[PDB]
Design a protein around this nucleic acid. Structure first.
Ligand SMILES: [Mg+2]
Ligand SMILES: [Mg+2]
Ligand SMILES: [Mg+2]
Ligand SMILES: [Mg+2]
Ligand SMILES: [Mg+2]
Ligand SMILES: [Mg+2]
Ligand SMILES: [Mg+2]
Ligand SMILES: [Mg+2]
Ligand SMILES: [Mg+2]
Ligand SMILES: [Mg+2]
Ligand SMILES: [Mg+2]
Ligand SMILES: [Mg+2]
Ligand SMILES: [Mg+2]
Ligand SMILES: [Mg+2]
Ligand SMILES: [Mg+2]
Ligand SMILES: [Mg+2]
Ligand SMILES: [Mg+2]
Ligand SMILES: [Mg+2]
Ligand SMILES: [Mg+2]
Ligand SMILES: [Mg+2]
Ligand SMILES: [Mg+2]
Ligand SMILES: [Mg+2]
Ligand SMILES: [Mg+2]
Ligand SMILES: [Mg+2]
Ligand SMILES: [Mg+2]
Ligand SMILES: [Mg+2]
Ligand SMILES: [Mg+2]
Ligand SMILES: [Mg+2]
Ligand SMILES: [Mg+2]
Ligand SMILES: [Mg+2]
Ligand SMILES: [Mg+2]
Ligand SMILES: [Mg+2]
Ligand SMILES: [Mg+2]
Ligand SMILES: [Mg+2]
Ligand SMILES: [Mg+2]
Ligand SMILES: [Mg+2]
Ligand SMILES: [Mg+2]
Ligand SMILES: [Mg+2]
Ligand SMILES: [Mg+2]
Lengths: 168, 96, 107, 89, 53, 57
RNA sequence: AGGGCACCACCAGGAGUGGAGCCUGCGGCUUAAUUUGACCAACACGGGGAAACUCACCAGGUCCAGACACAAUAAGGAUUGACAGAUUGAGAGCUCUUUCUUGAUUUUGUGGGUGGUGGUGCAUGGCCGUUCUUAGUUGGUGGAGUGAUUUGUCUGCUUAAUUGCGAUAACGAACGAGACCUUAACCUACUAAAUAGUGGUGCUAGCAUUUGCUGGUUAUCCACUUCUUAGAGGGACUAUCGGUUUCAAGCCGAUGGAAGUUUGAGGCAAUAACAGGUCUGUGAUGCCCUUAGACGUUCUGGGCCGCACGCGCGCUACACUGACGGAGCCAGCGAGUCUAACCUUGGCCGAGAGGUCUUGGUAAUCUUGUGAAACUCCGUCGUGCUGGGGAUAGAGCAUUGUAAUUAUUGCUCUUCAACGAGGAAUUCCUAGUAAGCGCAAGUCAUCAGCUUGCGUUGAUUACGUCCCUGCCCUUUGUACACACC
């Protein structure tokens, strides 16, 4: 559409980032972890990887028609040129995003952090993971803040294996 | 202030007819895309509905997403005087 | 409709050279079994989009700089083909991640 | 009685070679001198927080057993509620 | 319909804002990101800019 | 601050009753919104005509 | 006290800086305001090159963009907007004069919200900087000890490295280092290409001539891949051979090789910290402050640039290893517009800056061989602050922009300052490196003396030490553990 390739691929990246923060803000109480966009001839499909597909798909297509209409109205798509599917994250314990959200919803329910963080660490480690680490930083009933870690197993910190085998 | 009745009606009937409204957080844009009124009128009419219930709002990168609740459909049907329980508007109307 | 060539060029632009050369290999194999005359997949110089930032969000510290890169790889395959049986198998198994454009020509 | 440019061109005590008579104050040859950081360690709020607030914020060392055991229990609960609800019920 | 409420904003720092956070300083304009540098460092991976060397 | 809005009826019109017919003067205009405008000092208050208004009273 | 390590230490040196003039940042002073944070690890830093905007500051003027709930007041009009005059910087009905328009959208109150580049970074998150990219950290089993703990993790040698060899009450491992990834260097070996070239000639065409230099048509050509591109691979492992070493780990020399400095350069980077920076990047945020005479928002103008002065990063020089003139003449990394005006060739006009008519390019296609500058050759000068230097200043012509004054910048003519190599001190640096030289990008309407990268030309000196400085380890002393603040 008379745009450069350098600007078209950058704009595709910005569209992906904007949908990522939009679904991160919207679908946070039903465990959205990721989004994948497939641009096809006269369709673009948006796959939402979530831990709970039933509260992404709503009932009778509510809350997926809402997101399809919201996304096509913001990004100015013609109707039926963008479609939204949902699929459930298999091996939920190996997802760092989902475990961060599960810890966040544990701590907003008023639950102690050495219970919550260890209950995430053991769940990840018997979900079939090589290693797990949880760091909690902030202030908890004291003004003076501290940070505290909860690590079990084996972790790599340096090199291309971090980009390969580590979710953060 | 004076949002006139015709402009509040054409905000609320777009919201019923499409189900959702997106607005850019751009006051002084003064013409919303797909609603025939000012962007700030759209923002503040949907704020007025949000504060009394009736729609849920989200913000996300300066773009103001509004979606109707179930109390929203039973208020806008009363307000805009649409046929009683025939019209969802628009979830779900045309795809089942 | 009876074995008439079109002189098409398919340009393939992506950021992921595995998926992109897989699509170009599939196109080359399709032409190589349909016996289409084709110029092979010409590989353009890969463009690097460099963005240099300071790492700090304020302006404190040693002046440390980050170079981010986006790498864009481009191929094109020319063909002389019958369009109505090319597009009977083009529109299926649609590739994700790779931007494809097919431009017809009469040159 | 005007003022402005008319007053500035006949303003006495104004100009470079009339400031050049007036010698420079010694405030001009200083520097900020360690910005109140020679007592950065000493918390000037004056709290030195009690043990009870820290212990009931981050957990104390007396109840590590009860922390770890129900952490194990709820991790097992998450394992069971994943494993029994994939292609069952 | 009021003619006093705006001044020209066709060029310069006040004409462009970050598309994420509406900031004016530090804006990255290369390739049409229109993102400030601080939001770009947060969003660079899910745009496709990576650190390689 | 703004006008106090005295409880007006139809005004700037004499009567229907007084001896013995209707008494309304100032024959009709091309202005549909007919009705008298404001008269301040040798002017009227043009509201419907977008550009052209050439009669002065 | 001992032992290590490192051009953010030194040695041997190079190039400086500190002196001069400008430029920019900081302090101070001044001011209506000169917004502010930061004091190795602040000070060309906040991507901070601010005319407006930015903007946070100053002098003024609007608007509500005060949701919602409740109570009053409304339909006998709650309220809204306005021509013209006064008013005002204002063509703000701001407010009056006046009389029109308007129609449970308000207004007035009380709660409650909302906004804030307002405070607190010593309430915080995230990110970043630093310790420190230094080599450091940890557990299993065994030994020691009542125990806290300790040994492993070490005398020596080695390495860039807690890298190994060895020694050995430890043995066998994990994080960090290394591996890894990216980039650079080689491939006449493969796969290829009118968006890269080359050779011919189906084709033709010139100029000197009798083949040298060229210009042009890829079903209105044929072929190839050396050069270029990018896929798949290969390649180096310190190979081989000497020497040296506890015949170890390794180190040095030579030969071969594209490569024998971890092959060059990065990215990533442990345990833990710091009252390090950032609340002014964020619709990150607790609390507090403010909220219609606003600290919200907008508009106009000013300021951030103000100048007795102190300091930091720089640019330009002090010339002949040069300046000027002409001529020669060569890169690489980028970037670019219709999802609206970007990069601009060519032609014409102008001394120039620039204008104009066209064109090509959404880009290996066109700008662009980015014909860059230093450099090279031939001349002019001739040791004189000189034809070195170009500060300061006058006049004029242009461009950007709504707007150039406090000169935006560019050009032309004139004016022609300090400065003759810089005390005390101090910085960076070990090979395609220092230094010199420009170019592109970033911010950008305009503005580069800045930064980020790129290439062009390309040395001297060492391949060390612990003397200085900083850091690390061990031993040691401790009445310290909030840990010498
Ligand atoms: Mg490792
Ligand atoms: Mg490494
Ligand atoms: Mg050491
Ligand atoms: Mg020296
Ligand atoms: Mg100097
Ligand atoms: Mg100042
Ligand atoms: Mg501060
Ligand atoms: Mg500066
Ligand atoms: Mg502002
Ligand atoms: Mg002030
Ligand atoms: Mg403000
Ligand atoms: Mg804020
Ligand atoms: Mg704090
Ligand atoms: Mg701090
Ligand atoms: Mg912090
Ligand atoms: Mg142990
Ligand atoms: Mg033991
Ligand atoms: Mg030990
Ligand atoms: Mg030791
Ligand atoms: Mg090292
Ligand atoms: Mg080749
Ligand atoms: Mg502090
Ligand atoms: Mg912050
Ligand atoms: Mg705060
Ligand atoms: Mg700032
Ligand atoms: Mg202003
Ligand atoms: Mg400044
Ligand atoms: Mg600096
Ligand atoms: Mg010359
Ligand atoms: Mg070139
Ligand atoms: Mg050209
Ligand atoms: Mg002279
Ligand atoms: Mg000026
Ligand atoms: Mg000025
Ligand atoms: Mg520039
Ligand atoms: Mg400027
Ligand atoms: Mg700068
Ligand atoms: Mg020493
Ligand atoms: Mg003690």
């Amino acid at each position: 559409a008379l745009i450069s390739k350098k600007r078209k691929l950058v704009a595709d990246g910005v569209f992906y980032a904007e949908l990522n923060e939009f679904f991160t803000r919207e679908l946070a109480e039903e465990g959205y972890s990721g989004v994948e966009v497939r641009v096809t001839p006269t369709k673009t499909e948006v796959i939402i990887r979530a831990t709970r597909t039933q509260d992404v798909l709503g009932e009778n297509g509510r809350r997926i028609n809402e997101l399809t209409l919201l996304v096509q109205k913001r990004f100015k798509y013609a109707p039926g040129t963008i479609v939204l599917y949902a699929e459930r994250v298999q091996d939920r314990g190996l997802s760092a995003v989902a475990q961060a959200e599960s810890m966040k919803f544990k701590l907003l329910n008023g639950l102690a952090i050495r219970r919550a963080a260890y209950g995430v660490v053991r769940y990840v480690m018997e979900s079939g993971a090589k290693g797990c680490e949880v760091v909690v930083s902030g202030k908890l009933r004291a003004a003076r803040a501290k940070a505290m870690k909860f690590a079990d197993g084996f972790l790599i910190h340096s090199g291309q294996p971090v980009n390969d085998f580590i979710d953060t | 202030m004076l949002m006139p009745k015709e402009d509040r009606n054409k905000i609320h009937q777009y919201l019923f007819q499409e189900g959702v409204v997106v607005a850019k957080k751009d006051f002084n844009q003064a013409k919303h895309e797909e609603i025939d009124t000012k962007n700030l009128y759209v923002i503040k009419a949907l704020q007025s509905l949000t504060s009394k219930g009736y729609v849920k709002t989200q913000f996300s990168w300066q773009y103001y997403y509004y979606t109707l609740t179930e109390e929203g459909v039973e208020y806008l049907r009363e307000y805009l005087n649409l046929p009683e329980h025939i019209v969802p508007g628009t979830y779900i109307q045309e795809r089942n | 409709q009876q074995q008439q060539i079109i002189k098409i060029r398919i340009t393939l632009t992506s950021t992921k050279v595995k998926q992109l050369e897989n699509v170009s290999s599939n196109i080359v194999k399709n032409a190589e079994q349909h016996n289409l005359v084709k110029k092979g997949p010409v590989r353009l110089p890969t463009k690097v989009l460099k963005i240099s930032t300071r790492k700090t969000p304020n302006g404190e510290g040693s002046k440390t700089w980050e170079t981010y890169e986006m790498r864009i790889h481009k191929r094109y395959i020319d063909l002389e083909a019958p369009v109505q049986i090319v597009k009977r198998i083009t529109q299926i198994t649609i590739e994700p991640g790779v931007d494809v454009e097919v431009v017809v020509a009469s040159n | 009685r005007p003022s402005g440019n008319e007053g500035a061109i006949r303003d006495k005590t104004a100009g470079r070679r009339n400031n050049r008579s007036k010698d420079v104050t010694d405030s001009a040859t200083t520097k900020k001198s360690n910005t109140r950081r020679a007592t950065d360690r000493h918390s000037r709020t004056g709290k030195t927080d009690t043990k009870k607030k820290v212990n009931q914020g981050w957990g104390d060392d007396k109840k590590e057993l009860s922390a770890e055991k129900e952490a194990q229990a709820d991790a097992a609960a998450e394992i069971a509620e994943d494993a029994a609800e994939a292609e069952d019920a | 319909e009021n003619v006093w409420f705006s001044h020209p904003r066709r060029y310069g720092k006040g004409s462009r804002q970050c598309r994420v956070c509406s900031s004016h300083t530090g804006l990255i304009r290369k390739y049409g990101l229109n993102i400030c540098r601080q939001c770009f460092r947060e969003k660079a991976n899910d745009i496709g800019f990576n650190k390689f060397r | 601050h703004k006008h106090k809005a005295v409880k007006l009826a139809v005004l700037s019109y004499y009567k229907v009753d007084a001896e013995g017919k209707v008494t309304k003067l100032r024959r009709e205009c091309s202005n549909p919104t007919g009705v008298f405008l404001a008269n301040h000092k040798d002017r009227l208050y043009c509201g419907k005509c977008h550009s052209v208004y050439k009669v002065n009273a």
